[PDB]
UniProtKB/Swiss-Prot annotation:
It comes from Parengyodontium album. This is Proteinase K. GO terms for biological process: proteolysis. Its cofactor is Ca(2+). Disulfide bonds join C34-C123, C178-C249. Binds 2 calcium ions per subunit. GO terms for molecular function: metal ion binding; serine-type endopeptidase activity. Coiled coil: none annotated. The chain holds residues 106 to 384 of 384 of the full protein. Belongs to the peptidase S8 family. It catalyses: Hydrolysis of keratin, and of other proteins with subtilisin-like specificity. Hydrolyzes peptide amides. Its EC number is 3.4.21.64. It is an enzyme of class 3 (hydrolase).
Amino acid sequence: AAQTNAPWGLARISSTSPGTSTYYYDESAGQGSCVYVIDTGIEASHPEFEGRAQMVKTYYYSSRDGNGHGTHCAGTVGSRTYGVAKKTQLFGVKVLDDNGSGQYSTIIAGMDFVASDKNNRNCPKGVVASLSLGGGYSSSVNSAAARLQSSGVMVAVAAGNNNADARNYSPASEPSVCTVGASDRYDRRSSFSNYGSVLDIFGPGTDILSTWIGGSTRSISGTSMATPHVAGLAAYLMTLGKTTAASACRYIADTANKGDLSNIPFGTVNLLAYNNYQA
Ligand SMILES: [Ca+2]
């Protein structure tokens, strides 16, 4: 399958070089997998989700995404136009309020919820979780992300937008999950993107067009935008039977575009998420 005039991030995921405009992907498109988007919620009614999205848990007064961030990330995971895995099932877990902030105990609770809630969903190809959030280092937040990964969920987390080493940020610094940095359309590390040895992979994170609340769309930047690319890719690769949840992190790093990124500090991996599609 080929999506012409796709967002640059999708085209980047399916190409060894930057500057392309077509997203090439296998028609399976992550069908049979599921991705928990743990953020501000998902506007499941957005036509781009085609009814494949739904809220499963909120830790606030409404399950409604009043911010737009969670809808944007869910769109990059699996919306029709802006999604990596265009047939994956999206589950929204609203651990962040409509101002985009959420207490650590709430984020931990949402991760524990996903670890249990997946046991009553039909996700034969596997389960992914996209955590486009984070703050300062927390051993308990890291432990919660590790538990979610240990429970059999491919956990992708944002490295953070501090232009610092991700070692001081959670859940970015938890080793067992896949920590995602951000790159721009010219194969540079995004100016804001965190780095460090804890990073596993880079994804398109600068000027990412995706869904927004109110049935609209908008382009925003952040490692929070790179994370759903990697999670959508994991759901895409798991549906293809190429990897499992416990190994998708290394498989994606195994098959990434190597050395293509600039301004990667020494000690940070130079790997760009890549689906290695050929047809
Ligand atoms: Ca890791």
